[PDB]
């Protein structure tokens, strides 16, 4: 006895942010810990950051 | 807007009359380190005096 099953869908675009869980392919799991600005990060002597 | 946030400091503490601890607030999201670093590198090396 059900007349109108209305399913609604919801799409959320979840960006990365501190606290999320990232891991390589060698069990080296870890938690993202700070969204450091682009400049503060180390950078190679040709300018390209890491 | 390309018009920044200049600080409004709160304290200039002067313990021992020759060893000061200044504070500044606020700076841009990255200006803190840049100003601190420039000032340190200047004061340590490039600062005319006498000895």
């Amino acid at each position: 006895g059900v007349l109108k099953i209305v399913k609604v869908y919801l799409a959320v675009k979840r960006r990365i942010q501190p606290g999320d869980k990232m891991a390589g392919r060698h069990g080296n799991k870890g938690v993202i810990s700070k969204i450091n600005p682009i400049e503060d990060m180390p950078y190679d002597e040709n300018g390209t950051p890491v | 807007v390309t018009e920044f946030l200049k600080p409004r400091l709160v304290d200039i503490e002067q313990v021992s009359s020759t060893h000061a601890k200044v504070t500044l607030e606020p700076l841009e999201r990255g200006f803190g380190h840049t100003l601190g670093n420039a000032l340190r590198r200047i004061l340590l090396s490039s600062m005319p005096g006498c000895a």
């Binding site: 799409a11 950078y43 300018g47 390209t48 | 200049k6 409004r8 709160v10 500044l24």
Partner: protein, 270 residues
Amino acid sequence: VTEVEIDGVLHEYSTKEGVQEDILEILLNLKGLAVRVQGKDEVILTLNKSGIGPVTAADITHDGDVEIVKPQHVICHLTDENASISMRIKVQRGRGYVPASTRIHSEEDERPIGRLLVDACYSPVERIAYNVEAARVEQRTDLDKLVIEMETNGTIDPEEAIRRAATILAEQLEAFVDLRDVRQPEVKEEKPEFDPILLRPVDDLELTVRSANCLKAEAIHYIGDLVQRTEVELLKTPNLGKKSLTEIKDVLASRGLSLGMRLENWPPAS
């Protein structure tokens, strides 16, 4: 770019029969676009294309002040024969970087479902390397010639960016070039009580222009001087029915005030 709207789209997660890339890829590419504007601080560009072909940057309808930096920047690929894409693009100027959801200000922005919010990532510099070397100067040694190499979006000009950054740095340094006890906190303020609406004119209330000319023709331009306008001093106006009076009572009084109050604060400044 900071905002886009296409005709057939209802949300960035949709599709559009005819374009190869999905909507989200079009958003990413648009974000990848690089452009300079000169006079204004925002602009609304338009792109209309129809027929098979790679829809690229230069194929937009540029104005006189907006200037694309590189044409072959691919936006999408119209692959069906009679496919048509007509989109509007709000491109604004700012500082630094800002994500999408952090731009929420009201609900009218999201009112048109066609609104799509690309996260603005505008920072004309992409990578900045530098290094020093010994400068064979006129007469000294160990004078250091500094070289700065910059990979940028062709948006900002090298000397332009250098001098802008130098101005920023010099100003921010000037904040304590003469540092002191400038500490801010103060107390015991005496504030002009009148609400800023009173300084503003009638057109700062979203009223019908007819009642605007009516209160013009009945000696009302400010708002602190229409509150000094008795209730009998309003309807005498040439041709007030109820509608112009509706706007009057709505955007003058019904928003909190009266249709004329015997106040004695104004003028504290005029």
